[model samples]
Target: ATTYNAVVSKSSSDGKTFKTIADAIASAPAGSTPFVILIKNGVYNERLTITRNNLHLKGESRNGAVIAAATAAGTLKSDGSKWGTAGSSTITISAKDFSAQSLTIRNDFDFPANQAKSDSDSSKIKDTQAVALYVTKSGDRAYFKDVSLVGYQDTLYVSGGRSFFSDCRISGTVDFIFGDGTALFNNCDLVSRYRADVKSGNVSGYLTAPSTNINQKYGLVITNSRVIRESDSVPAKSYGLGRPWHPTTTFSDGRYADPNAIGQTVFLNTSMDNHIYGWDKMSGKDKNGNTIWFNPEDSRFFEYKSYGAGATVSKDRRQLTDAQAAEYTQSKVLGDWTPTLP
Candidate 1:
C-alpha cells in the first residue's frame, strides 16, 4: 500500500482529509521531501494552480478521478475581459520535480457550439485557444504517467523547462501539444479529433506547434507511440503532423518572431493513422506587415523509422539517420534522471 500526506475526496464523510485538491496542495509542508497527495474517484470542477516543488499527485483511477473546468480563452474574467490562452488552462503548474499519475486533466470548453456560429454573432466564442494543462518555465523536470489531457484548441502548453510523459493520452483538435519546452512522450497516444476546420471543408487540425528556443536540443520528441483519430468521422489526410510557432515574442525592439524560437520536434518508431499528413507552414507579419512564413526546412523537425498508413519518407518530412536517431534516447532528453510512479 502507498502512503499519502493528504487525501481529497468529494464526500464529506468517511473521514476524508480535504474536500478539494487545491486545498490539500496549499497545505503541503515546506520541505525537500516529496508531498504525496491522493485524489479519490470523483469529477472535480475547479481551476488548479500547483506551485509547490517535489509534489506527487496520485489518483484512484485515470478516467474516474477527473479534474475538469470550462474556462476558455474567451471566458470573461472578473474584469470583464478575456483570459487569453495561457490564463485559460485548467491546471497551471510552476514547480520543480512535479509528478502526477492515473489522472485526467480536461478543459471541457464548448468549442464546437461556439465555432458553429460566425464571429459576428454575439453568441460565438471570441477566442478558442483554450488550454488544458499549462506548465510554466519554473515547472522543470515534470513527469506524468497514465494521465489523459483532453481539450480542443491549444491543449497542452509546456512553456519551458523539461517534461517527460509516459503512457499518457493527449487528445485535441488544433495545436494540441505545443510550447517551447523539451518534452519526451514515451508510449503515449496522440489523438486528433474533427472540429470546426473540418466542418468548413478543411483538414481537421495540426498535432503540434512547438516554439522551442533555438538552442534547446529537444523540443517535443515521441517514441514508440501511436498517432490516431478520435473516430472515423475525421476524414483521411485531414491532419498535418505539426507547424512551427514563433509567437510574436516581446523584445526590446518590438514584438516579432524572436529568432530564438526555432522549434524542434521528432517522432521515432511511431505509428500514424491515414488521417495524418506532412508538416505545414505557419506565417506571421513583421513590423512592416510583411507575411513571413515558417516552414519545416527552417526548423529541426524530423522522423525516424515511422511506419503506418500515413507515414511516408518524403522530401518535406525529413528522416533521421541511424546515428542521429540513436542520440534521441530517453536519458539524453531527460538528462541523468529517471521518473517513477507516485
Candidate 2:
C-alpha cells in the first residue's frame, strides 16, 4: 500500500487537498525520499514545471486524469519571444528520480490551425513544435508506466538522461517520440496520428527523430511494441519509421550540423501498420552552401523481427542479428538501474 503525500482533486467537495495539480507540486518537498502526489480524475489544464528531485505522480486512472496545455513553438512568452520547441512543453521535468504512472500528458497546440500549406500558399502558421513532456538532462533515471503522451508534433522530448517507459501510449503526427536521451520504450503503442495535410496525400509523417549524442551507446530503443496509423486515410507509404536528426549549431567557423548529434534508434520485435516503409533521410546545407544528407545507413538505426503489413525486408531496412539483439536487453540499455514504484 502506498501513502500519498499530497492529493489533487478537481472537486472541492470530494474530500481532497488541492484543486490543481500545480498546487500539489508546489507543496511537495525536495529530497531523496519520493514525494508521492495522488492526482484524482480531472482535466488539469496548466503548464507544469518539476524541479524538485524524487517526485512521483500517481494518477487514479490513466485515461481519466489528464494534464494539458496549449503552447506552441510560435507562442509568445512574457519576453515577447517565441516559446520554441523546448519551451513549449506542457510538462517540463528537470530533476533526478522522477516517476509517474497512470496519467496522460497532452499538448493541444491546435495543429490544424498551424499546419503548413501544401501548395505555394505560405499563409499557414510556422514553428508548430509543441511538446507534451520534456525530460531535461537533470531528469535522470526517470520512469513512466501506463501513461499516455498526447500531441501532434514533437510530443515527448527526452532531451537527455536515462529513462524508461513501460506500457505507454505515445501519439503524434510528426517527429513525436524524439530526443537524445537513452530511453527504453517497452510494450508501448507508438500511434501515428492523422492530420489535415493527409487530405492532400503529399504529407509524409515521421515517427522517431532521435538526436542522440555520438558518445552514447544506446539512444531510443523500442521493444515488443506496436506502431499503428490512426486511420487508413493517412495514405500508404506516407510514413517513415524514423529520421535521423542532427541539430545545427553555430560556431566561429560557421553554422554546421553538430558533430555529436549522431542520431541512433532501434526497434525490436515490434509490429507496425502498412504505412511505414522504413527510415527516411534528413538533410541540411552547411555554411559552405553544400547539402549534407544524413542517411539511415550512416546512423545506428536497426530493426529485428518487424513483421507486419508495413514491414519490408529490404536492404535499406537494416536487421540486427540474434547475437546483436542480445546486447540490447533492458538492463544493458539502462545500465544497472532498475525501475520500481516506491
Candidate 3:
C-alpha cells in the first residue's frame, strides 16, 4: 500500500529506474497493496505492461500522462501465454481489477511510412497491425475515464472480461475498437480518422468489428455516444457502420441459420454523422463467404432515439423504444459488479 512517482526527469541516462514503466510496476509489492503509480506529463517513448493483479495506474490528466511507442505488430512481444494469443501490443493489460484513469495510451506507429509501403492496397501494409491497448485474460474490470487511445488499425483490444469506458476519446482509421470482450461505451466520442483510400469516394471501412462469440451475452454496446467524421470534406459514403468478423457456420433453406451473425453491436441514443453507413450495407458477408447482414427477422442491432444524418431506419435497423432501452442499461449487462470511474 505505497504510492510511487515516475518522473522522466528523475531517471538516469540509461533509464534504468524510469526506463520502462513496467519496471516500476514489477518492483512493487505483491497482493492488495494498492500501489498507485503517478506518472508525470511527457511523451514516454517506451512499451508498458501490467502483469500483476490489483494495480492502479493513474495520471495527472488525460493529456498529461502520455505513453507513446513506435513498435509494430511484428516486433512487439509478451511473456504471458494468454496475452501471446492476441499478438503483441504497445500496452498489454494482463492482470485483474486493473484501473487506469486520465491517461493517454498511444502506439506511435509511423502511419505515413505505412501508407507509402501499402501502395494501393491499404490492407497489405504491416503498420496497420499496430495496437495501443491490448487487454487479455479474465477478471479485467477496467475503468478508463477521460482516456485517449490514439493509433491506427487495432486501437483498443478489449479481448477479455467485462469492461467499461466512459467519457473517453478513441481515434483511428480501421476497426479501432475491436475485440471479444463484454464492453460498454457510455457517453464516449468515436471519431473516424479519414483514410486516403476511402476519402477518394470509395468505401472507407467499418468503425467497429465486435469479435464477440455467439455464446457471449454482452458484446460492444455504445450508449449515449457520438460518432463523427474526422473531416467534413470527405465523402459521406466512405465509411461503414460495422461488419461481422465471426459469423455462424450454418446455412438454412436458401437463407442463413443463425441470423445474428454480425455479433451484438447496440447503438443506444447515439448521434451519428453522415459517414456512418446503414446497417444493411455494413453487416453483409464474412471472410468465410457467408451472408452476415442483419436479417430483419433476427439480428440484435437496436437504436433508441438516435438522430443525425446517418441515423436512418428501415427494415434492417431496429429502433428500440424508450422502455426497451431502460432495460438494457450498463447495470443490466454488468449486473451488480459495476465499475466506478476515477
Best model number under TM-score: 1
Predicted structure 2, TM vs. truth = 0.94
Q: Write down the lDDT of every candidate, Cα atoms only.
A: 0.89, 0.87, 0.69
Give me the runs in candidate 3 sitting further than 4 Å from their true place: 1-19, 74-85, 118-127, 247-262, 280-299
* Candidate 2 lDDT by residue in tens digits, 1-342: 879999999887978588898899888765677799999999999899889889999998999999999998988878988899999999999988889999999999888766655555564557888999999987899999999999999999987789999999999988888889998999999988777666665555788988898899999999999999888877777788888888777878888876568888899999989878789888876668688888878888899899789888888999999999998999899997898887
The TM-score values for the models, in the order shown, are 0.96, 0.94, 0.81
Which run of 10 residues does model 3 get worst, by summed lDDT? 76-85
lDDT string for model 3 (193-303, tens) is: 777544365766667767677778887888899988878764686666665554333554433333333466778889998887755233545545565455323435567
Ranking by TM-score: 1, 2, 3
Kindly indicate the candidate among 1 and 2 with the higher TM-score: 1
**What's the distance in Å from true for residue 288, model 1?**
2.7
CA lDDT, candidate 1, residue 17: 76
Best by lDDT: 1
- Which parts of model 2 are misplaced by more than 4 Å? 116-124, 199-203, 250-255, 287-290
